[PDB]
Amino acid sequence: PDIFNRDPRDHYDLLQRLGGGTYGEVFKARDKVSGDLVALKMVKMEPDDDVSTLQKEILILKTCRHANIVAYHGSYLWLQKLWICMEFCGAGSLQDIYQVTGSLSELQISYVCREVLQGLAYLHSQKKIHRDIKGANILINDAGEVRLADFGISAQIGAELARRLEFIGTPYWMAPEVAAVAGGYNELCDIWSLGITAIELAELQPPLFDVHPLRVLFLMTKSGYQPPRLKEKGKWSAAFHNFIKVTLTKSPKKRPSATKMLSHQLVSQPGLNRGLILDLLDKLK
Numbered sequence: 001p002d003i004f005n006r007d008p009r010d011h012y013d014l015l016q017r018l019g020g021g022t023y024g025e026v027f028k029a030r031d032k033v034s035g036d037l038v039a040l041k042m043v044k045m046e047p048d049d050d051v052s053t054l055q056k057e058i059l060i061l062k063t064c065r066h067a068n069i070v071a072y073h074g075s076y077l078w079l080q081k082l083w084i085c086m087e088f089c090g091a092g093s094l095q096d097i098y099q100v101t102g103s104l105s106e107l108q109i110s111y112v113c114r115e116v117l118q119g120l121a122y123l124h125s126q127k128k129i130h131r132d133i134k135g136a137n138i139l140i141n142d143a144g145e146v147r148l149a150d151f152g153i154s155a156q157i158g159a160e161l162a163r164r165l166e167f168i169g170t171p172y173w174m175a176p177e178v179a180a181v182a183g184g185y186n187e188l189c190d191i192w193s194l195g196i197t198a199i200e201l202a203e204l205q206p207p208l209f210d211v212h213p214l215r216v217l218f219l220m221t222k223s224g225y226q227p228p229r230l231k232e233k234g235k236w237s238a239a240f241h242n243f244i245k246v247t248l249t250k251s252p253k254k255r256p257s258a259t260k261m262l263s264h265q266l267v268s269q270p271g272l273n274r275g276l277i278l279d280l281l282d283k284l285k
């Protein structure tokens, strides 16, 4: 039994608003019995949403589990709002972190990319394209563990239509074959997004972020679009530059899979562990 017809406040104390976007509004909350901290996400239900589809979406969240994806605990449906209870990730998103710390070290980025690649390899095996890989959608808990905030864009939830169309105002992390579809693309779009995210963690913004989103969207559709590169050449190793070159392969017919990317020297160098992130969180305190 799940998706209870009741106020989540009956079981949880709402402490503070953590943030939100097209995916919903997120709150810090505390289990009234055990005292454990959770994140409660509120998503408004649209008139064309149906609970038969909703039940199928929640079943995917319950069954599909991986160490690099934020765990689902349970859900509520109250006054046309779907409330999702999930694992609390105390440090917030990588964007919340780098806005305070500044750029991540190459080693710290290598660790984050290895963890995200593991989460992506899992989703792609379950035939799920994430389509929303970016620093704001990668969370860090108090143990320095890396978690994808969600499985990516929901295929059949009403509120997620705005998320599916969000690339119009924010196309910077999107693969060119996605922008230039207006025939097709596949799961390798998430590998390009990870490449852009790796530049974002290094430079505090994705490539061309200051260019109007509508101009970027059009530039990606044009023939001759050159994949971005790291700006400061002398700051990064040949292995990091090569990792960017490989993930940002323009043709998806030449771009490696999430599993293959795990064989890259950057993400298989020695000393990659959560201790690198605990050290990043030490700058915060």
Ligand SMILES: CNc1nc(Nc2cn(C)nc2C)c(C(N)=O)nc1-c1cncc2c1ncn2C
Residues within 6 Å of the ligand: 018, 019, 020, 023, 026, 039, 041, 070, 086, 087, 088, 089, 090, 091, 092, 093, 096, 136, 137, 138, 139, 149, 150
């Ligand atoms: C605002 N989003 C989030 N915040 C969170 N916590 C947080 C944020 N801050 C600043 N500090 C804390 C402690 C947490 C969490 N699980 O702890 N989950 C999200 C979140 C949830 N679902 C989808 C998401 C999310 N994030 C992006 N997508 C696409």
